[PDB]
C-alpha cells in the first residue's frame, strides 16, 4: 500500500546504525509487546 515518495540513501545508512545499538530511528519503532523492531509497511 502506498504511503509517500522516497527518502534518501544517506538516511538509510544512519537508520541501520541506530537499530544495531538498540535505538529507534525515524523509520524504526520498537514494540515492547513483541520485543521486536518494526519498520513501516509500505
Amino acid at each position: 500500500q502506498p504511503q509517500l515518495v522516497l527518502l534518501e540513501e544517506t538516511d538509510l545508512v544512519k537508520a541501520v546504525l541506530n537499530v544495531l545499538i538498540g535505538v529507534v530511528s525515524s523509520t524504526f519503532s520498537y514494540n515492547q509487546a513483541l520485543q521486536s523492531f518494526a519498520v513501516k509497511q509500505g
Binding site: 541506530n18 535505538v23 529507534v24 530511528s25 525515524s26
Partner: protein, 91 residues
C-alpha cells in the same frame, strides 16, 4: 539535526559535573538524592532514546555526591569520614 545534536552534547556535559543543565532541569525528590531529570520536548524520538540511556550515569553520580556531602554532616572521628573522602578522590 546535527546542530540540535551539538545542542545536546553540551547539555549532556552540564549534568556530568553535577550542575543544572541548560534544557535539562533537575527536580529534587528529597533534595536531589535521586534526580528526576526534565529534558526538553522532542521533535524526533531518535535522539530522545540516545539521551535516555545516558542519564543513569548521572543518577548514580547524584547518590554518591549526596552521600559524600552528607559526610560533612558526619563530622566526627568515624570510618565513614575516611571512606567518603576517599570516595571524593574517586569523584
Amino acid at each position: 539535526l546535527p546542530s540540535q545534536e551539538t545542542c545536546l552534547v553540551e547539555d549532556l556535559l552540564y549534568i556530568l559535573i553535577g550542575v543544572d543543565g541548560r534544557y535539562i532541569s533537575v527536580q529534587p525528590l528529597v533534595g536531589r538524592q535521586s534526580r528526576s531529570f526534565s529534558v526538553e520536548q522532542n521533535l524526533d524520538s531518535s535522539v530522545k532514546e540516545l539521551v535516555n540511556r545516558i542519564l543513569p550515569v548521572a543518577t548514580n553520580y547524584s547518590t554518591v555526591t549526596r552521600f559524600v556531602e552528607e559526610n560533612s554532616s558526619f563530622e566526627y572521628g568515624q570510618v565513614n569520614h575516611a571512606l567518603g573522602a576517599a570516595m571524593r578522590t574517586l569523584g
